[PDB]
Amino acid sequence: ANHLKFIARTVMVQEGNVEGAYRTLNRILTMDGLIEDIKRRRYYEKPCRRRQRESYETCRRIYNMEMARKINFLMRKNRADPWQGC
Amino acid sequence: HRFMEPYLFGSRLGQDIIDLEQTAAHLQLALNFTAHVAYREGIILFVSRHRQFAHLIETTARDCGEYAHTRYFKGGLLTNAPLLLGPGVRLPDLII
Amino acid sequence: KNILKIRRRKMNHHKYRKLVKRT
Amino acid sequence: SRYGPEYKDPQIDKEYYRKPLAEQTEEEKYERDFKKTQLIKAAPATKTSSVFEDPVISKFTNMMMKGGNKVLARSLMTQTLEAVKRKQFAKYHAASAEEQATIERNPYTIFHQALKNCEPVIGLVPILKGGHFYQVPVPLADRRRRFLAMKWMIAECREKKHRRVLMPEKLSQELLEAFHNQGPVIKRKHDMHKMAEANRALAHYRWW
Amino acid sequence: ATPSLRGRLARLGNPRRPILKPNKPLILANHVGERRREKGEATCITEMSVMMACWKQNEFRDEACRKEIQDFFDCASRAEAARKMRSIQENLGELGSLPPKKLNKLLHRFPNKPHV
Amino acid sequence: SSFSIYPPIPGQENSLRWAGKKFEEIPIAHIKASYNNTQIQVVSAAHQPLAHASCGTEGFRNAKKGTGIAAQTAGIAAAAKATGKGVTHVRVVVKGLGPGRLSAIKGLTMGGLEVISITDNTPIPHNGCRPRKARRL
RNA sequence: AGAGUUAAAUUAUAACUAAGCUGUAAAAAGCCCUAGUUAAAAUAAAAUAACCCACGAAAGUGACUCUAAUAAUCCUGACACACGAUAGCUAGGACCCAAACUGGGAUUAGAUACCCCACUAUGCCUAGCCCUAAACCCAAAUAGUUACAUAACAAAACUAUUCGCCAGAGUACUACUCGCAACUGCCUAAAACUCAAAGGACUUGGCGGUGCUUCACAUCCACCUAGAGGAGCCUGUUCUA
Ligand SMILES: [Mg+2]
Ligand SMILES: [Mg+2]
Ligand SMILES: [Mg+2]
Ligand SMILES: [Mg+2]
Ligand SMILES: [Mg+2]
Ligand SMILES: [Mg+2]
Ligand SMILES: [Mg+2]
Ligand SMILES: [Mg+2]
Ligand SMILES: [Mg+2]
Ligand SMILES: [Mg+2]
Ligand SMILES: [Mg+2]
Ligand SMILES: [Mg+2]
Ligand SMILES: [Mg+2]
Ligand SMILES: [Mg+2]
Ligand SMILES: [Mg+2]
Ligand SMILES: [Mg+2]
Ligand SMILES: [Mg+2]
Ligand SMILES: [Mg+2]
Ligand SMILES: [Mg+2]
Ligand SMILES: [Mg+2]
Ligand SMILES: [Mg+2]
Ligand SMILES: [Mg+2]
Ligand SMILES: [Mg+2]
Ligand SMILES: [Mg+2]
Ligand SMILES: [Mg+2]
Ligand SMILES: [Mg+2]
Ligand SMILES: [Mg+2]
């Protein structure tokens, strides 16, 4: 309100392309986490539920990061086997 | 492995180094035992599950006249030999 | 599991509270 | 069902084989059609190489057929065509010179035009959501649209006529009304379109 | 990078209050999850709207406007073609990673050792 | 062709004009996209309301106006009234996350308004007023 | 623990425009002193940072600034002393928003519930009480070891010095006592009586109005054709005789 308008969360369209500008803005909001916060703030969540959600998300992130790291590590062994039939 | 500590000389920047004095000491006894088993007409089976030198191991066993196993080891091979190999089968006297 | 004993204690406490309220 | 999956549908068009040298894209396919030992099913009795038959007419005759009286269905179709031809000729001869250049007497083209006029554009699908059925508007396939167009006219002419009036006589009038966009089949199509326009707000219920 | 795991779980050696309370043990499995199929949605809604715009102003007659109806038919044909082809292209290719069937075999080739 | 998605703030000296008017004088279009309704109000740069159109104002109903088609139609309805008063370019300010969010934006273009920028002014409190309790107890 | 301050949102309050706004799977009710934009005090709370793991004995604490300040030259140790989440009580104040209860509107055979609307105590500040939680990390404190050694699962098995508890289950977070600003309250806490069991863990089936993939080819739907349930008759049943 007190801040200047048309500065935050504003994207300029290029050559009349509106669908792509909307996708760019949606990606901006998703990467900044505003979409999830807005969807979460529709109904109040109790602190116990907030802590449970944070712990579950942290565990899921750790597991996904480790699985991705192992997949990237083992990506080398996807080549064709040179010792087939031995 | 935890049981390889007495058999290790040290670590050279992460990579463990195996001492060769104990290696030769064990290898002399191993070769003597294998030679005695072969001399006493014993069945020697070269077992190795590794898809890089399977052909080399098979050729070495063929040259030696001893037997080889470099493929998928079946479950009841040595235990349930009378049903996996034949009615009456003589088990190998040495496994390398 | 332990939920059976928890529910039994809950029912006993609820009945005691209702009895106290009535009398 | 007696034909195995390897059997392929026959080709009845004679011009497809008469000039295979006019194009090369079809050559690459028709040369390997027989090389793969592709067996061909027997040609159906209904379909032939005659130039005076149309698949739309055959489908309409099959739909009008009751039980297995294909001869009766064919006779009804021929009588309907004769009736529409004679009714068009009567109006052609009763009209003046300017209307003769506009009125059409060919029964096949007016039949096809009436079917296209009575073909619906979109249909309604009942979708269960929240324990209630909603008539979601949905685009229709070409075969479904043609089948609905034929079925509406057949059902209307089978029941909305007098006992003394015969099926070819009723169908002759109904074909002309549909061609001129005045028939109850056209009214039913408009009713379906209006229902779809009313239920357009429920189109988000569709998931395909 | 990987989030820190030191001092997170409830263990005898951990002196502080546990931070994470995993639903299931944090053991890296030897098989990745199967790819989830995307939920379908209604298509050609914006074109059906402009098609019905003709009818609402022309008393529901197709002889008034024809371009909207033809465009709606083209949209329906394109939607059907995309439903047919994407259903077999997406389950085959992802353009960013290997198929889950190959990934499961790759993981089984180099599995984890929670024991010993 | 150096193009920046950042808005042209008045503090700079860039020369960008739309129909001869600067970015500051271009009218605004506030699109409030709720979970059950979508409202559009096109106002001038001087905060003077020019046009107003909502999904309920188009003859829809309770659950009918909550769909995206209602917002797409309301976009055209607002664009027609905006063009009736001589508006060619407008700055879209979106408020709230709803199903008819992009639908109204594209309906404006369908109705004949050229969007130059999309502003997402969604009210996100910094843990201020306590919202209502969760559903499905 | 005190003193001072507010960035976002919301609202009491005014102006222009418009007719609905809100409400759900769908509706109805409610408000049309309504809704959108532009300005707007007071109260409440403190987006991202936080994929951080710090402080405090625990409860608990993460919008900003300032003051005071976080014991023990460090073992255990009560019924003694001091604290003790939310909820509730008393007196005074504030009340945007949320909400027990309540009153309407939905659904249901019933719905004094889940769903929507309005509103009260209350959640907010000062002082005084109340002293309870799945107050759980269900793992006591102090210094240690990786020796022997997997009931099962789970957070691996254990030493040395202590304190507090545990003697089948139901009765029973009960009755009767003592004590307590608590008087529908808290702590401690039995017995008669009934049974031969009460329990923790695990395996296999079965089930699931759990969820994710692949399906239905006369099969569920999207859809096609011909019939039953309407009439007479034939025939077989259930009933009266
Ligand atoms: Mg009891
Ligand atoms: Mg601590
Ligand atoms: Mg668990
Ligand atoms: Mg509950
Ligand atoms: Mg204070
Ligand atoms: Mg403010
Ligand atoms: Mg006030
Ligand atoms: Mg009403
Ligand atoms: Mg904050
Ligand atoms: Mg200290
Ligand atoms: Mg002490
Ligand atoms: Mg209180
Ligand atoms: Mg109040
Ligand atoms: Mg309220
Ligand atoms: Mg009620
Ligand atoms: Mg307290
Ligand atoms: Mg706690
Ligand atoms: Mg305990
Ligand atoms: Mg102690
Ligand atoms: Mg076991
Ligand atoms: Mg006892
Ligand atoms: Mg108690
Ligand atoms: Mg008591
Ligand atoms: Mg059937
Ligand atoms: Mg019959
Ligand atoms: Mg019948
Ligand atoms: Mg009958």
PDB file of C-alpha atoms in Angstrom, chain A residues 54-56 58-63 65-67 69-71 74-75 77-79, chain E residues 2-5 20-22 27-29 32 98 102-103 106-107 109-112:
ATOM      1  CA  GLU A  54       7.651 -28.764   7.670  1.00  0.00           C
ATOM      2  CA  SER A  55       9.209 -31.985   8.981  1.00  0.00           C
ATOM      3  CA  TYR A  56       7.572 -34.075   6.249  1.00  0.00           C
ATOM      4  CA  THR A  58      12.259 -31.578   4.891  1.00  0.00           C
ATOM      5  CA  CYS A  59      12.441 -35.381   4.962  1.00  0.00           C
ATOM      6  CA  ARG A  60      10.987 -35.605   1.446  1.00  0.00           C
ATOM      7  CA  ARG A  61      13.474 -33.015   0.175  1.00  0.00           C
ATOM      8  CA  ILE A  62      16.392 -34.892   1.743  1.00  0.00           C
ATOM      9  CA  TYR A  63      15.261 -38.191   0.223  1.00  0.00           C
ATOM     10  CA  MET A  65      18.086 -34.890  -3.171  1.00  0.00           C
ATOM     11  CA  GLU A  66      19.868 -38.112  -2.206  1.00  0.00           C
ATOM     12  CA  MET A  67      18.014 -40.135  -4.851  1.00  0.00           C
ATOM     13  CA  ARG A  69      22.495 -37.521  -6.408  1.00  0.00           C
ATOM     14  CA  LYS A  70      22.677 -41.319  -6.649  1.00  0.00           C
ATOM     15  CA  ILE A  71      20.977 -41.276 -10.067  1.00  0.00           C
ATOM     16  CA  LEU A  74      25.124 -43.974 -11.519  1.00  0.00           C
ATOM     17  CA  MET A  75      24.221 -42.352 -14.859  1.00  0.00           C
ATOM     18  CA  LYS A  77      26.901 -47.098 -15.926  1.00  0.00           C
ATOM     19  CA  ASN A  78      23.937 -46.779 -18.324  1.00  0.00           C
ATOM     20  CA  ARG A  79      26.197 -47.498 -21.314  1.00  0.00           C
TER      21      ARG A  79
ATOM     22  CA  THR E   2      21.598 -32.003   0.538  1.00  0.00           C
ATOM     23  CA  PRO E   3      20.065 -30.559   3.729  1.00  0.00           C
ATOM     24  CA  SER E   4      21.970 -31.296   6.917  1.00  0.00           C
ATOM     25  CA  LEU E   5      21.012 -34.429   8.837  1.00  0.00           C
ATOM     26  CA  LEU E  20      12.814 -34.233  12.047  1.00  0.00           C
ATOM     27  CA  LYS E  21      10.236 -36.959  12.746  1.00  0.00           C
ATOM     28  CA  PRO E  22      10.316 -39.163   9.624  1.00  0.00           C
ATOM     29  CA  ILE E  27      16.811 -45.483   3.761  1.00  0.00           C
ATOM     30  CA  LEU E  28      17.493 -45.020   0.058  1.00  0.00           C
ATOM     31  CA  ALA E  29      15.419 -47.625  -1.766  1.00  0.00           C
ATOM     32  CA  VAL E  32      12.334 -45.092  -7.916  1.00  0.00           C
ATOM     33  CA  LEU E  98      15.762 -42.333 -18.044  1.00  0.00           C
ATOM     34  CA  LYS E 102      15.697 -48.750 -16.696  1.00  0.00           C
ATOM     35  CA  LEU E 103      16.313 -46.751 -13.509  1.00  0.00           C
ATOM     36  CA  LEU E 106      20.373 -49.445 -12.727  1.00  0.00           C
ATOM     37  CA  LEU E 107      19.686 -49.090  -8.993  1.00  0.00           C
ATOM     38  CA  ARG E 109      22.948 -53.042 -10.215  1.00  0.00           C
ATOM     39  CA  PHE E 110      24.397 -50.802  -7.458  1.00  0.00           C
ATOM     40  CA  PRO E 111      22.068 -51.211  -4.467  1.00  0.00           C
ATOM     41  CA  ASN E 112      22.390 -49.760  -0.985  1.00  0.00           C
TER      42      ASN E 112
END
